[PDB]
Design a protein around this ligand. Structure first.
Ligand SMILES: Nc1ncnc2c1ncn2[C@@H]1O[C@H](COP(=O)(O)OP(=O)(O)OP(=O)(O)O)[C@@H](O)[C@H]1O
Ligand SMILES: Nc1ncnc2c1ncn2[C@@H]1O[C@H](COP(=O)(O)OP(=O)(O)OP(=O)(O)O)[C@@H](O)[C@H]1O
Ligand SMILES: Nc1ncnc2c1ncn2[C@@H]1O[C@H](COP(=O)(O)OP(=O)(O)OP(=O)(O)O)[C@@H](O)[C@H]1O
Ligand SMILES: Nc1ncnc2c1ncn2[C@@H]1O[C@H](COP(=O)(O)OP(=O)(O)OP(=O)(O)O)[C@@H](O)[C@H]1O
Ligand SMILES: Nc1ncnc2c1ncn2[C@@H]1O[C@H](COP(=O)(O)OP(=O)(O)OP(=O)(O)O)[C@@H](O)[C@H]1O
Ligand SMILES: Nc1ncnc2c1ncn2[C@@H]1O[C@H](COP(=O)(O)OP(=O)(O)OP(=O)(O)O)[C@@H](O)[C@H]1O
Ligand SMILES: Nc1ncnc2c1ncn2[C@@H]1O[C@H](COP(=O)(O)OP(=O)(O)OP(=O)(O)O)[C@@H](O)[C@H]1O
Ligand SMILES: Nc1ncnc2c1ncn2[C@@H]1O[C@H](COP(=O)(O)OP(=O)(O)OP(=O)(O)O)[C@@H](O)[C@H]1O
Ligand SMILES: [Zn+2]
Ligand SMILES: [Zn+2]
Ligand SMILES: [Zn+2]
Ligand SMILES: [Zn+2]
Ligand SMILES: [Zn+2]
Ligand SMILES: [Zn+2]
Ligand SMILES: [Zn+2]
Ligand SMILES: [Zn+2]
Ligand SMILES: [Zn+2]
Ligand SMILES: [Zn+2]
Ligand SMILES: [Zn+2]
Ligand SMILES: [Zn+2]
Lengths: 147, 147, 147, 147, 147, 147, 147, 147, 147, 147, 147, 147
């Protein structure tokens, strides 16, 4: 990493410790040229921006609850819901963005949910793909037969 | 009744009053321990059996909130939702079923909801008409085109 | 209470039980004339309507937290904050309304908060009394000297 | 680093990459237990000491949210709030204090906030200028009339 | 359904069978985790609302046990208790009340119990006829002498 | 205490310790004449003999539950029930017997229960005083008017 | 299942939910002909009838404790006892009866216990097979040599 | 001694009395906190070391209950069991062992139990004579035929 | 307090917060002349120096345990021991020293212990007052008679 | 025996060996679960009954530690303490008491301790000779002067 | 095992029970010749002697903490540290000694620690192998290259 | 500040006093609940950021203890350690770093420690100079030979 003071191309790591909660790693680095020591923090935090304008930490439990409610009346097991939540969280974190919108969360859910149950996928994409008339629903039923 | 402040198991009744309509009784109570007064209302409210064994008081607010969450992203005004809720409550009161469940409450909304919107109606009716297959959605789409 | 079926002026109570959680009392009444038995529930539930349009149960902890944050930098004890929360909850419940707006909650807070601390009261009423210019603040400082 | 999915204490580093700017490092990590990959970013971020001993990364979002909550009920646009946050961040970066606390961050907002509004400025400056008395509010009101 | 052995949340259905009478369905299920099979029976059983909001399946065994505990120390044979339970169940089935409570079940026992015994009847009827005063007991003693 | 070995009229206590659970006190005594050390245990254990022939430790919770069920439909508070249980336990222990029958427990309950509620006392003594006909109940109602 | 009202040969399931505790599944069915909706409950409850005449829920812990006491002084591990309890519970539930006698529980235990330990099996069957004289014990020792 | 009512750690001694026999001391105690009195008895009771390190007071009731549970299903009267318990207690008192264990107590029952019954004796002696093999049972059956 | 930078005679407090654990108070002060802000911490920590050379936080539980062991065989209650520990802690903290030796702790204990029990005080001062011969013990017994 | 590593309830015995002296048996055991071996030693050790009901193996180390803590601040060498411990163990082994308590172990130390020191002896003998009064200490001081 | 009374070459085991905490097994044995019953205890206790002269039970957590601190700044995982602690405990227990010195504990740690990390092994053996000058460190670095 | 005795959240300030030096303030406080007084000291102490985010007051005692534990087994006197600690504290005070971490404190010890000893210096400098390889130890050994 570039030294904050002299902008040297590289620096050496002289201390590293994982935080007690395990979320972040605190490192202390020293610049080889100017011999100056600076502190850096490495995190894996993820945030979702609510439609009301408030950002809150990502939660797999809320995704599982939402997909469970959307799968009401269908034969879905708890192991399948947990696996779907894990897949959604992994796919969301793979983008690398620190914060994302809940619409993108729903779009990510749309993938595994189709493999889970077709009725729940249809009644979920009717909201998150913005269906406007019966024709849009009929086209979606046709895409599912093609896939 | 348990005190709302200090959770004392028993509370006296300072006074009681029957409303002019006669379907409600309003009581003022005082906790023997903390000597802090509060108020209670007793009504012969219509109960609905949930999907579990728990019975819950009927509330038009929950019906309106559910249909609005089903109507999100659609051009549905609040006046139409209020009229739909009033019609559903009137229907469930007029039927006078021996054992009223929340499934029957969800069934009473399909009628009024069909006139308001078709996308929201299809979403809502996909649950309480127990949709098992995509072909069942197509049959409802054909019925909506006929109506 | 009036009998739901025959609208008799009064009815007799033949059963009563406090709920396990203690929030409500379930009574069973019998009409003296038509000999018909009906069930009533007595509750003390209280709800606050958020500015976002969602109603949630009243909480004294949130009131205490808000007044504590508004009293930042001032000599306020935890016993005083707990007593203020108790007073606010008692005054709110005394109105008898099942649901109220958070603006009314702030107006109720405005009473005891003035007795608690003047600076916090000023910086709280500047929001909940809708002060517009410096003149409104100066008039409030004058009312506090008069009181 | 603890795995975000299964909370395994240690995680390998699949790969690392230094950004073009050079002030950040982006790493892809994999959990040895569940074999689920995620991403982390390490930056030499400016830390602020809170009112407790806990140090928190600097975020313009928190400053903007706080000033907006102070500016509620006032004709303040979002562009003005963004400009105020940018000015505050630039000021705190330019001062280069040896030990930067959140109190100094709250002090850097009074300047820009005085131009935007007077009610919101008086609310915000009543805290970080440590207002003890009503007369202190009057002196600030006189200063605002002069400026 | 949760497995009775290892409490796994979901269980498959190995097979199902409809009984000759047609009012019951007997299923054999297997837990996916432990692969241990068990059996379940589904019936459209008559539910009674307890003194709380909890609904419980009707059981003549509970009625017989309660009346026997009320008949302790009295010359009442088991055949008479069985006949009383059968009569009470037949009465509650024949009335076909819209909302059947345990209070009505306790009321259906007073009739048959009056013939069997007078001490046990007076004990049992002191509850469900809501006896408030000693004079109410005397009026029931006079009624028993008349009958 | 008499020495177990030589039957000396008195002995001296040389060690004493209360048990960790606090139920018993273990003492070590030495005989002044023969200089012999022996161990004694002091207990306050109390047992009730069930009608099935099994002896179990005395419990105030069971007494409270029984009197609560016998007071069904009557205005009895939890503090009153706890005080009645305490009085029953104290009166039972005052006799000094290590074991007693549940009939004696009911006879002890009969005292405070009359002061608590007359209806519950009547329906409890009808079982624990062995009433045989309506005449026995009428005589009991007369004794209550006299007292 | 047959419709309770019109006795139609079959009915359709329109709602299903597993209970929170997971013991039962509540279904709502609708008759295709008369369009009437009725509620059914599916359970896996099991009861054992004590020799005193009281029925209590089946417990694997009590079976394990009994076989452990019967295996006193013998080399039996806790894993073996847990497996024996699981086998006993599975064999008991395989019969399909909702309630069974403890004698049948002992007869079920007699199977795996013989494979576990011969001495414990002998001293357990001497009670649950009703041995009368030494000849019955000698014959049992001979059956074990044959098997 | 801990109070039986409120569990206060220490209790005073209101009075003490030595019995006429001299082997017991009866004390009346009062709790300083709740001021509720109770009674205690101190005796130099004979202790038996259980299979663990815990020592328990000797009780003929436990011996009689154990032998009766061993004698279930056999024509053994209660008088014979009482005589057996008296003989066992007399034997264990007369031996005067330095360290008396419950194993020795179980050994003192085989003698008297041999005369009462043979099936119950064989069951009981299969434990405390440490039966390892079926041949050991056969040798005891041969000994019983000789005696 | 003097300003750390310019040594001004006095400074103003502009921020104060009690720590979450409540042990310390963190204040932020500003010098009136040089307008410089500095952080101070107020603590009430107390340490005892073990004879092995290690300093550990003061504990009332250890003092109570020590005095309890020194009072073995004497009539001392738990309330008295707790009060003695409280008195010892208060007297130790009254000196104002952050760290003290365990010998001073014993000297502080010597005060209340004499009022508690004379035998324990003698056997405790024989260690913490360094008695050398029987004459020193005799003189101490004489001082106790004088006091 | 529970495994020391993973706490598995049962452990096999890899091998056993009887020592040359014959008073000990050394076994090597292996846990079935983790397959980690350990060693155990079984001896017919002399047990002492503590002040509670718990029996503890006799250990000269505890006696030496206790007397040393009593001898602190006194010119007592470690060789003298070892000789005292050896003498006490020899005495308690030679007496062969039927029921050996820790009080008798504390009594066996007074003899040897009288020769070693007088201050430490007086401290130690103030406990196990049950000193009630200062005059009892004076009588022991007179006895020490005579001896 | 040899009989404690008559020194017979072998004895038979007639009772065995594992302790509730699982640390020890209590056996009761009987001598075939003199027919005398004696109690033995089998334990797996392990103790470490601190350099201050106090013996305390062996703890794997302390070993893990020590090696973790010695591995500061090195890539060591928690699973590796737990495995090293398990190996150290197993190797220590394999010697069969009931008590050992902490120097031997460090010597045991020296084995796996070399396989874990070379820098930590060097900085740990510099203390537990008593390095005196730079030459001793250089020789150790040479042994590591050879191994 | 929380009371050290009863943990009451808030404590009054009985009195305050500024020390002659002026860098400390000594206050006497009293708890409102228990009315037990204690003392507190407030100083503008130099804080060091630990390897985590927690800041800790600087203490020469910790530095001396750490270096002594590093110097164990070496001929280093306590006076030399005190001089080293004084030099390290003077150096860290004289540098006046903007953000002082414990890593910099560990770096300030290498200088003075090089003169005192070479083995202890090599141990201590193997951590804070971040030794990755054995060759890095050899380079430091060569540097020590040069110096
Ligand atoms: N904290 C959270 N972490 C992760 N995903 C979340 C979180 N909160 C909500 N979600 C996801 O976002 C979806 C919500 O989408 P939507 O934008 O309609 O809701 P919202 O605006 O958050 O809800 P609300 O109506 O309560 O304001 C949920 O179905 C869920 O999958
Ligand atoms: N207490 C109530 N009063 C009136 N209408 C209700 C009540 N509870 C639910 N409803 C409405 O009746 C329908 C019942 O929906 P649904 O079967 O999903 O409810 P539920 O029992 O709450 O389900 P779940 O408990 O699984 O979330 C919806 O339209 C809902 O808005
Ligand atoms: N659940 C609650 N129960 C009781 N009082 C509440 C509750 N939530 C908020 N309040 C009160 O209402 C006040 C909030 O007023 P305001 O209308 O500005 O907030 P809001 O709209 O609820 O907040 P938000 O900005 O998070 O949507 C709080 O200071 C508190 O006293
Ligand atoms: N463990 C107990 N401790 C104290 N009192 C008890 C206990 N168990 C029961 N009781 C008292 O004894 C009364 C029971 O009297 P009764 O002889 O009719 O019952 P029982 O024979 O114990 O009951 P069951 O019918 O269950 O065998 C209860 O009302 C209660 O007051
Ligand atoms: N709640 C229970 N669930 C399952 N099995 C049980 C339960 N209670 C007892 N059992 C089984 O039944 C056996 C008891 O048989 P038995 O008929 O002799 O006892 P009981 O009549 O229940 O006992 P008691 O003498 O206490 O009245 C036990 O060994 C155990 O295996
Ligand atoms: N952490 C502590 N906090 C407060 N008081 C303590 C603490 N530890 C010990 N004490 C007090 O100090 C006394 C100990 O005095 P002493 O100097 O003989 O012990 P020590 O050197 O600490 O013990 P050890 O022999 O275990 O090293 C105890 O009786 C107790 O009152
Ligand atoms: N297991 C043991 N083996 C040998 N000697 C012991 C043992 N336990 C205690 N002792 C010694 O015997 C005497 C008993 O002292 P004391 O009565 O105070 O012990 P205690 O039962 O441990 O007391 P407490 O449990 O109340 O601390 C002391 O001299 C003690 O060192
Ligand atoms: N209770 C324990 N159980 C097992 N191992 C231990 C225990 N306590 C310490 N150890 C081991 O012994 C090592 C300590 O060696 P050392 O002799 O230097 O310490 P010590 O004398 O016990 O410590 P102290 O300086 O605190 O008195 C630790 O690194 C650890 O591996
Ligand atoms: Zn640089
Ligand atoms: Zn209250
Ligand atoms: Zn009516
Ligand atoms: Zn993982
Ligand atoms: Zn299962
Ligand atoms: Zn004697
Ligand atoms: Zn039908
Ligand atoms: Zn008490
Ligand atoms: Zn200054
Ligand atoms: Zn293991
Ligand atoms: Zn022998
Ligand atoms: Zn206090």
């Amino acid at each position: 990493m570039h030294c904050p003071f002299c902008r040297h191309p590289d620096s050496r790591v002289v201390d590293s410790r994982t935080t007690d909660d395990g979320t972040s790693i605190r490192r202390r680095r020293q610049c080889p040229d100017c011999s100056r020591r600076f502190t850096t923090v490495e995190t894996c935090s993820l945030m979702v921006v609510k439609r009301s304008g408030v950002t809150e930490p990502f939660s797999r439990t809320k995704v599982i609850n939402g997909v469970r409610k959307a799968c009401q009346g269908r034969p879905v097991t708890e192991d399948a819901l947990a696996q779907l939540g894990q897949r959604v969280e992994e796919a969301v974190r793979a983008t690398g963005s620190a914060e994302l919108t809940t619409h993108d969360v729903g779009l990510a859910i749309l993938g595994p949910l189709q493999e889970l149950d077709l009725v729940a996928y249809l009644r979920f994409a009717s909201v998150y793909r913005a269906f406007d008339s019966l024709e849009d629903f009929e086209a979606a039923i046709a895409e599912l037969r093609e896939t």
